[PDB]
Amino acid sequence: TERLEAMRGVISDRHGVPLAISTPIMKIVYTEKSYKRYYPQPQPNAQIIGLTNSEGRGIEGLEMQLNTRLAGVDGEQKIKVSEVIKEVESGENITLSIDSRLQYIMYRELTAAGVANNARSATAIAVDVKTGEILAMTSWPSYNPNDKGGLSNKDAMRNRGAIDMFEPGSTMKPFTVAAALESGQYTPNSIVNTAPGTMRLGWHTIRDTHNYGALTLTGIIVKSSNVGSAKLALSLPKEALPSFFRRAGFGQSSDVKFPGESAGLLYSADKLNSSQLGTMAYGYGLNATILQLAQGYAMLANHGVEMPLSLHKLDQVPEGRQVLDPKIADQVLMMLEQVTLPGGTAKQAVIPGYRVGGKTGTAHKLRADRKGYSNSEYRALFAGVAPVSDPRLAMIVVVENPQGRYYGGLVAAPVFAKIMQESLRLLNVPLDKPLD
């Protein structure tokens, strides 16, 4: 009697492009047939797909997670030729939500941004706002799983997007404003005094980039006022923000439930303090992931309907979660478009032919000697949506420890412009902005 090795299932992209395949291999008297795993699009897909053992077992990513479905069942055959004791059962073929072309484009630009910025890493995600499908999710630096030598687990192995949590910063501002709009205390045109560009929250003092004076709720977003944001928190009921942020998906891991996925950090209003609630308003007394960020912006661009995040191609269309009223979501959407226009703080996110709506952010490390916030250690963030008239894609870009042209989040904005434009054209999304 001899074993009959089950061919491991094919992992493919949404259009059937093979991403993980198995090829017959022989051991030499008699022969022994085994299978060798091969990854045709290596570096862009490695952190999501993972890797197998010498034995053929998944030890990382989706190879690990979906190992029982992908491995199948080994057969048995009597030892001359040929009579089966137990029939062979091939592993299940898996089709992902991922578009390998969008994946290739995202990885290529993430490398360009990481090299130009002498960064520690550059991570991104693209989601179909209407379906909840992840079309691209990659991180630079990645690795080649087909190669057996060397390796660096410490960073490259290692889905950063799913495992890394950070303070969202200004990327939180549109959710703070959405909480203020739903309270019925405010309208987009409602005024908040931000003079003289500073404000005190206990022994902590908050500053804006400039004295923006009296701002509307739309102005809080467009000028990215930390003062306006904190003042909104102060005027609202104590429960307002932690409760709206919980309904938006923060403080909990996403529907993907990727191995090792972070849930972020979000405290309830009972864990107290008005000045701590003042800090949450501009994204500081809380931790988020790129997945929670992507799902929140996809919601804002899908008439307040948060579609469940998925790494698998759909064979049912979910109804989604109605987190916000459609009028509020549309209002916030309109404020995000204005951030990219003259007078705005996200002008470098602009794409010709496509109306863009988004927000920059900066996530600063606390600093070892506790002498304020670190100027070197920080994440440049960009959360955006396009085309604004009928949004198709939500995209988050995170650049770790950049040393480039701009200080702060602005560094992640032209990276988004690049990926979003090429991604919308590849999907053949019709233009919605007059060309000049």
Is the Cβ–Cβ distance between 267 and 241 less than 8 Å?
Answer: no
For helices 100-116 and 42-49, give the axis angle rounded to 10 degrees.
100
Among residues 9, 10, 19, the alpha carbon closest in space to that of 71 is found at 9
How far is CA 1 from each of CA 26, 56, 76, 77, 242, rounded to the nearest angstrom? Answer: 18, 21, 7, 6, 63
Buried b (16+ CB within 10 A) or exposed e, 379-389: bbbbbbbbbbe
CA dihedral for 79, 84, 85, 86, sign (positive or negative): positive
321 bridge partner residues: 306
Is the Cβ–Cβ distance between 408 and 378 less than 8 Å?
Answer: yes
Q: What secondary structure, in 3-state letters, does the chain show?
A: CEEECCCCCCEECCCCCEEEEEEEEEECCCCEEEEEEECCCHHHHHHHHCCECCCCCECCHHHHHCHHHHHCECEEEECCCCEEEECCECCCCEEECCCHHHHHHHHHHHHHHHHHCCCCEEEEEEEECCCCEEEEEEEECCCCCCCCCCCCHHHHCCCHHHHCCECCHHHCHHHHHHHHHHCCCCCCCCEEECCCCEEEECCEEEECCCCCCEEEHHHHHHCCCHHHHHHHHHHCCCCHHHHHHHHCCCCCCCCCCCCCCCCCECCCHHHCCHHHHHHHCCCCCCEECHHHHHHHHHHHCCCCEECCCECECCCCCCCCEECCCHHHHHHHHHHHHHHCCCCCCCHHHCECCECCEEEEEEEECCCCCCCCCCCCCEEEEEEEEECCCCCCEEEEEEEECCCCCCCCHHHCHHHHHHHHHHHHHHCCCCCCCCCC
**How far is the C-alpha of 75 from the C-alpha of 383, rounded, in Å?**
50
Is the Cβ–Cβ distance between 71 and 57 less than 8 Å?
Answer: yes
Pairing of strands 393-400, 378-386: antiparallel
**How far is the C-alpha of 396 from the C-alpha of 123, rounded, in Å?**
8
Among residues 119, 182, 204, 41, the alpha carbon closest in space to that of 378 is found at 119
Q: Which method was used?
A: X-ray
The single residue listed with the structure tokens 């459609």 is 326
Q: Which two tokens stand for residue 229?
A: 């944001």
Among residues 310, 305, 401, 320, the alpha carbon closest in space to that of 362 is found at 401
Is the Cβ–Cβ distance between 173 and 245 less than 8 Å?
Answer: no
**How far is the C-alpha of 98 from the C-alpha of 96, rounded, in Å?**
5
Q: How many CB atoms lie within 10 A of CB 151?
A: 12
Buried b (16+ CB within 10 A) or exposed e, 103-127: bbbbbbbbbebbebbebbbbbbbbb
Q: Which two tokens stand for residue 11?
A: 């992992």
How far is CA 326 from each of CA 144, 182, 306, rounded to the nearest angstrom? Answer: 44, 11, 11
Q: Which two tokens stand for residue 149?
A: 């030598």
How far is CA 238 from each of CA 75, 179, 232, 390, rounded to the nearest angstrom? Answer: 62, 12, 11, 35
Is the Cβ–Cβ distance between 187 and 180 less than 8 Å?
Answer: no
How far is CA 389 from each of CA 125, 331, 334, rounded to the nearest angstrom? Answer: 21, 12, 9
Is the Cβ–Cβ distance between 289 and 165 less than 8 Å?
Answer: yes
Is the Cβ–Cβ distance between 314 and 131 less than 8 Å?
Answer: yes
Is the Cβ–Cβ distance between 9 and 90 less than 8 Å?
Answer: yes
Those residues with Cβ within 8 angstroms of residue 433's Cβ, 6 or more apart along the chain or in another chain: 351, 352, 353, 354, 355, 387
Expressed in angstroms, the distance from the first to the final Cα of the chain is: 75
84 bridge partner residues: 77
136 bridge partner residues: 126
**How far is the C-alpha of 264 from the C-alpha of 288, rounded, in Å?**
5
Pairing of strands 75-78, 83-86: antiparallel
Amino acid symbol at 312: H
Question: In terms of C-beta density within 10 A (0-12 exposed, 13-18 middle, 19 or more buried), how is residue 257 classed?
Answer: exposed
**How far is the C-alpha of 92 from the C-alpha of 265, rounded, in Å?**
36
As a CATH number, domain 98-144+342-436 is 3.30.450.330
Q: Which two tokens stand for residue 220?
A: 């809080």
**How far is the C-alpha of 292 from the C-alpha of 171, rounded, in Å?**
11
**How far is the C-alpha of 282 from the C-alpha of 207, rounded, in Å?**
11
**How far is the C-alpha of 358 from the C-alpha of 362, rounded, in Å?**
14
Phi, psi angles (nearest 5°) of residue 369: -80, 10
Cis peptide before 423 (omega within 30 of 0): no
As a CATH number, domain 159-341 is 3.40.710.10
Phi, psi angles (nearest 5°) of residue 385: -140, 145
Give catalytic residues, as residue numbers: 170
Pairing of strands 94-95, 11-12: parallel
Is the Cβ–Cβ distance between 199 and 275 less than 8 Å?
Answer: no
For helices 290-300 and 173-182, give the axis angle rounded to 10 degrees.
40
